[PDB]
Amino acid sequence: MVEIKLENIVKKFGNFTALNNINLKIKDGEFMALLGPSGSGKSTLLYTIAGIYKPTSGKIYFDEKDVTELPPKDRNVGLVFQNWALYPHMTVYKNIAFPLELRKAPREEIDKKVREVAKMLHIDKLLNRYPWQLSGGQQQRVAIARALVKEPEVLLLDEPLSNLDALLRLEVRAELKRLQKELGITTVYVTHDQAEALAMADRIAVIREGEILQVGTPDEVYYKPKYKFVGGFLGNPPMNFVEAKVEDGKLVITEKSKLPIPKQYVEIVKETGITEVIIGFRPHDAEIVKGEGEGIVGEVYSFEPLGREQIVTVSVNDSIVKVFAPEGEHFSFGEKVTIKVKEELLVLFDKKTEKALEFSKL
Amino acid sequence: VEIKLENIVKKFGNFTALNNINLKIKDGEFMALLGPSGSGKSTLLYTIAGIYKPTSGKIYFDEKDVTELPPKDRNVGLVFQNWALYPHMTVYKNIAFPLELRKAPREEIDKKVREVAKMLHIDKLLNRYPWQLSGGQQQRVAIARALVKEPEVLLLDEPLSNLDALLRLEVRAELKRLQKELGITTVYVTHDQAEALAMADRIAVIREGEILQVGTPDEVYYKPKYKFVGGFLGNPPMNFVEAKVEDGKLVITEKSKLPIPKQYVEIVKETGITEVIIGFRPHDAEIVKGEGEGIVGEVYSFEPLGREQIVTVSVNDSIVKVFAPEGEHFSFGEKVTIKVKEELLVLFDKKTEKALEFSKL
C-alpha cells in the first residue's frame, strides 16, 4: 500500500499552533499509533493526513505523489471518526453501500464491494440486520467496513474504540490488529490509551503540544524515553519522578534524601553545568524497604491492590511516587521507608527542558 | 511421478537446443534447472511438459513412455514465465476455466476451485478481479490454476519473475513449503543462483543445451564439476585464473607463480597437462597489502557488498573478486597478494573446463 511522509507540517489557525513542524514517515503496511493526551494535536494531525484540515505550510506525500492540496476524495483514504455512528433505519448492507449510493455507483458494483468488505470484517451474516440488532463490537466492524468500501490506500482511525465499553475494547483491539495485518493496509491510529498503543502498534509517535516528542517501537518509547513526558505517559502506573538539585556532586532530594550522581552522568552533568534535575524510575524498577537507609526516603502514604501485588504510594517531600510491593506486607500511613532503585534503571532529565540526559552509547 | 529423460536431443533444424540430456527427477523432489538466458533450461522444461517433442530420445513418467503424449495426457501442471490471468474473469473463474474447457460438472469445478484456493491461501480473493490483486496474490492464483487438474508433476518456468526483491525472498520459501506439503514432483526453471540454492533439493546446471552437473546445493557449490558451474553459483561466483604448468609450478605471469597445490600434483603430472584453470571463491581468499606469498595482483576497484567490501583485483590479463573487511582502505593500482589456502583451490582442465580429480580422502 502507501508510504506516507509528512515534511515540516505546520498548522496554525492563528496564534495557537496546533501542529508544529511535524516530520514523520508512516511505512507501507505499518500500524502507526498517534498517542497523546487531549488537545495534543494527535487528532488534528490525523485530520491533516486525511485532508479535512489543510496545513498552513509543509508537504504531505503518499508514495511519490504530493497530495498536500488534494481534497480527501482524491487521496484515497478511509476514515473512522471518534464518535462514529450507523444510521439506525438502514440495514448493515445499506450503511456500507450508502457512500457509494451517494456517488451514483452502479448497483452491481456496490453489491460486489459490500460482499467483499463484509467478509473481511466478519459481518456477512448481519447484512440484513439494523444497528439496534448489533453489538457495539459488531457495529464497530460495520463502521470499518464502510471506511473500506471505496478501497483506500490508508486507513485512518481517530480513537474509534472510544464508543465501546472498556471490557469489549480489550478484545476488539486485538481483532483490529489482525485485520490490519491481513489487509496490509497502512494504518494511522489516534489514541490517548498508552496500553492500547503499546499492544497494537508497530511504532508509536508520542504527541505533545502540537509536537512529536518521539517516535519508536513500543520497546523504544517505553525503555528509552527521550523526554520526561514520554516516560510519564506510558505504563500503569507510569514513570515516577522526583526533583533534585545537584549539590556537591550528589542529587539532593531532601534535607534527608540524596543519591550519588550515577557515574555514567558525571561528565555530562559537570560539562553542561546542569543543577536542577528530575530523577525518573518506573514503579517496577524499585523496591520499598522500611526505615531510613540510603536511597530516596519518604513516608508511606497509601496502598492499593494491583493484580496480585499492591501499589504503595510514597510521598517524597512535595512529590508522590508509586512502587510495587508484595501483597503480604502492611505499610502504615506516614511510616518511614527508603526506595531502592538500581542506578542502571534511573533516567535523569533536565528540569527546565525535560530532556533525558544520555551518555555515550556502549 | 518419477521422471526419466533418456538421451534427449532437441534440434530446430541447424540449432541444437538440447544436446543429449539424461536426467532422473525423483518422485516428490524439487528440481531446479539453473542456467543463463538462452541456455536451453526453458526448452528442457517445455520438453518435460510435452509442448515440445524430442528430436530423438525418450521421456518416462514412472515407467510409462509418455514421449508422444501432450501435456494434458501426461498430467502436467505448467506455469509459463509470462503467465497471466484473464482480466475479465474473477479469480474463481480463472481457476475454473481449465476445468470448464474439459467439460467438468458443476460439483467438480466448485470443489476443486475452492480447495486449491484454501491451499494457496487465496480463498478470500475468489470474487475479485486480477486488477485488484497484488503481484504476490496473482502468482498464487497462477499456481492454484496449475493444480486444479490434479497434476502428477508441477513445472514452473521462472514464474516469480514479476515479484519485487524482498517479497520474492519469502515467497520462494512459501512455494517450497507448499511443494513439500503436497509432495508433488516439481521442476523449477531459474537463472537465479541464490534462489535455486535456497529452494531446490537438487540443481541441474544448464549451459548451451547440456546439463553440466546435477547435485544438491552443497554438491554443485562446494564440488563443482566444470568451470561454468563454479562461475554460475555464488555472488560473486568463483574466480578463475589461467596458469601454465612448468616444473611443479603453476605460472600465471613472470611475477605470479605458485606451487601446484599439493593435492593436485599427482593428477596434473600424470596427465602431462600444460595449462589449467585455477579456481577459488571470493570468500575463500584473503587480500594482503604488498607482494609476497601467493597470487599477486593490483587493485582494480572496490565496493560494499553486505557488511563487507568486495575488491576487484587485476591478475594481469584477468579479473578476480575477493572479500575484505568493510573498514579496510584499498585504491586503484595498489599492489596486493591474494592469499589462497590450497585446500580451497580447485583446478580445471583448460580445454574441457572439467575439474581435475585427485585420489579421494
Parse chain A into domains and list their residue ranges: 1-238, 239-281+343-362, 282-342
Residues 6+ apart with CB under 8 A from B254: none
Spatial separation of the C-alpha atoms in residues B139 and B130, rounded to whole Å: 10
Method: X-ray
The nearest CA of chain B is from the CA of A148 a distance in Å of: 14
Chain A interface disruption, residue of B127, B131, B137, B170, most A CBs within 10 A: B127
Chain A interface disruption, residue of B92, B122, B123, B124, most A CBs within 10 A: B124
Beta carbons within 10 angstroms of residue A25's beta carbon = 14
| Grid coordinates belonging to A86 | 450507523
Question: Are A232 and A278 in contact, with CB atoms under 8 Å apart?
Answer: no
Give every strand in the sheet of B285-289, ordered side by side: B285-289, B335-340, B295-304, B308-315, B318-325
* Half-sphere exposure at residue B21, Cβ-oriented, CA atoms within 13 angstroms: 36
Sign, CA dihedral B64-B66-B71-B76, equals positive
CATH 1.10.3210.10 fits B1-237, yes or no: no
Burial-class residue B329 by CB neighbours within 10 Å (0-12, 13-18, 19+). Answer: exposed
- Residue at grid coordinates 583451490: B345
Resolution of the model in angstroms: 1.9
CATH 2.40.50.140 fits A282-342, yes or no: yes
| Grid coordinates belonging to B190 | 531459474
SS3 A346: coil
| Grid coordinates belonging to B235 | 555472488
Which residues on A lie below 8 Å from B127 (Cβ)? 112, 115-116
Beta-carbon separation of B127 and A112 below 8 A:
yes
- Residue at grid coordinates 557449490: B221
Q: State the architecture of A1-238 in CATH terms.
A: 3-Layer(aba) Sandwich (3.40)
Cα dist. B178→A30, B39, B169 in Å? Answer: 27, 28, 15
Chain A residues 148-207 with a CB less than 8 Å from chain B? 151
Pinpoint the alpha helices (H) of chain B: 41-49, 71-74, 91-101, 106-119, 135-147, 165-182, 193-199, 217-222, 227-232, 265-271
Spatial separation of the C-alpha atoms in residues B138 and B343, rounded to whole Å: 47
Residues 6+ apart with CB under 8 A from A91: A127, A128, A129, A130
Spatial separation of the C-alpha atoms in residues B347 and A360, rounded to whole Å: 52
Residue range A239-281+343-362, CATH number: 2.40.50.100
Beta carbons within 10 angstroms of residue A347's beta carbon = 23
Instruction: Give strand pairing partners of A298.
Output: A337
Chain A residues 68-127 with a CB less than 8 Å from chain B? 112, 115-116, 119-120
Question: Are A138 and A163 in contact, with CB atoms under 8 Å apart?
Answer: no
Spatial separation of the C-alpha atoms in residues B209 and B43, rounded to whole Å: 9
Which residues on B lie below 8 Å from A151 (Cβ)? 132
Residues 6+ apart with CB under 8 A from B273: B245, B349, B350, B356
Q: Is B7 on the interface with A (CB under 8 A)?
A: no
Residues 6+ apart with CB under 8 A from B81: B42, B157, B158, B159, B161, B189
Question: Are B130 and B111 in contact, with CB atoms under 8 Å apart?
Answer: no
B290: left (phi over 0), alpha (psi -120 to 50) or beta: left
Which residues on A lie below 8 Å from B128 (Cβ)? 116
Which amino acid is it at A189?
A: Y
Residue of A nearest to B132 (CA): A151
Nearest to A121, CA basis, from A146, A90, A155 = A146
Pinpoint the alpha helices (H) of chain A: 42-50, 72-75, 92-102, 107-120, 136-148, 166-183, 194-200, 218-223, 228-233, 266-272
Spatial separation of the C-alpha atoms in residues B16 and A103, rounded to whole Å: 62
Which residues on A lie below 8 Å from B132 (Cβ)? 151
Fold of B238-280+342-361: OB fold (Dihydrolipoamide Acetyltransferase, E2P) (2.40.50)
SS3 A174: helix
Give every strand in the sheet of B64-65, ordered side by side: B15-25, B3-12, B56-61, B64-65
Spatial separation of the C-alpha atoms in residues B333 and B301, rounded to whole Å: 9
SS3 A100: helix
Residues 6+ apart with CB under 8 A from A308: A327
SS (H, E, C) B43-108: HHHHHHHCCCCCCEEEEEECCEECCCCCHHHHCEEEECCCCCCCCCCCHHHHHHHHHHHCCCCHHH
Domains A239-281+343-362 and A282-342 share a fold: yes
Chain B interface disruption, residue of A27, A109, A116, most B CBs within 10 A: A116
Beta-carbon separation of B128 and A115 below 8 A:
no
Fold of B281-341: OB fold (Dihydrolipoamide Acetyltransferase, E2P) (2.40.50)
Rg (CA), chain B: 25
Residue of A nearest to B121 (CA): A182
Spatial separation of the C-alpha atoms in residues A71 and A75, rounded to whole Å: 7
Residue of B nearest to A115 (CA): B127
- Residue at grid coordinates 485530520: A47
Cα dist. B224→A121, A197, A346, B203, B229 in Å? Answer: 54, 54, 58, 12, 6
